[PDB]
Amino acid sequence: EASGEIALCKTGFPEDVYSAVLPKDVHEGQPLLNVKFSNCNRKRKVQYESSEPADFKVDEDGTVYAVRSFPLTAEQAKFLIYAQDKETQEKWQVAVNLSREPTLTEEPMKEPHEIEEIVFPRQLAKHSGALQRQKR
Numbered sequence: 001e002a003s004g005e006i007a008l009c010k011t012g013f014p015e016d017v018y019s020a021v022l023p024k025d026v027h028e029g030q031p032l033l034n035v036k037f038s039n040c041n042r043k044r045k046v047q048y049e050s051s052e053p054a055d056f057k058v059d060e061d062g063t064v065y066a067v068r069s070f071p072l073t074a075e076q077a078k079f080l081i082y083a084q085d086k087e088t089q090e091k092w093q094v095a096v097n098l099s100r101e102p103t104l105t106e107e108p109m110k111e112p113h114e115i116e117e118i119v120f121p122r123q124l125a126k127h128s129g130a131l132q133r134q135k136r
Contacts, residue, residue: 009038009040009041010038010040011037011038011039011040011041011044011085011088011090012037012038012083012085012090012091012092013035013036013037013038013083013092013093013094014036014038016094017094017095017096017097018033018035018036018094018095018096018097018115019096019097019098019099019101019114019115019116020033020066020096020097020098020115021098021099021100021101021115021116021118022066022069022072022077022098022099022100023069024069024072024073024100025069026069026070026072026073027069028055028067028068028069029067030054030065030066030067030068030069031065031066032063032064032065032066033063033064033065033066033096033115034061034062034063034064034115035062035063035064035081035094035096036062037062037083037092041087041088043087044085044087044088045060045085045086045087046060046083046084046085046086046087046090046091047082047083047084047086048060048062048064048081048082048083048084049081049082050064050079050081051079051080051081051082052064052066052077052078052079052096052098053070053071053077053079054066054067054068054069054070054072054077054098055067055068056079058081062083064081064096066098072098076097076098076099076100077097077098077099078095078096078097078098079095079096080093080094080095080096081093081094081096101116101118103119106119106120108120
């Protein structure tokens with residue numbers, strides 16, 4: 001942009017945390033959360049692991065599924081999804097927090113996606129493939 005900071009690739013999580021919203025009403029088959037695992041190099045199947053009270057499924061693609069809404073009531077539920085690349089002998093850890101995010105702010109600056117899919121819908125793209133019609 002116009003500041004100059006770093007330029008090295010960072011495979012793994014960005015040392016941050018993700019937040020998934022749940023009905024907190026004991027509803028099972030809850031939505032699926034997706035972590036932003038930074039990719040790089042070529043081919044790197046790593047191992048994943050979950051640790052949430054309810055039922056969760058970490059997919060090698062970097063997606064931990066949220067199932068069962070327990071406890072999720074008097075407080076919030078939080079767990080850590082561990083990652084480990086056997087190729088680069090590296091490992092990462094991202095904290096996902098299941099909590100209610102009743103935010104009214106409707107003006108995203110540089111981070112529209114936020115594992116919420118609540119405000120600012122995402123279904124308005126007619127263009128699907130490449131059509132040649134610029135002329136004639």
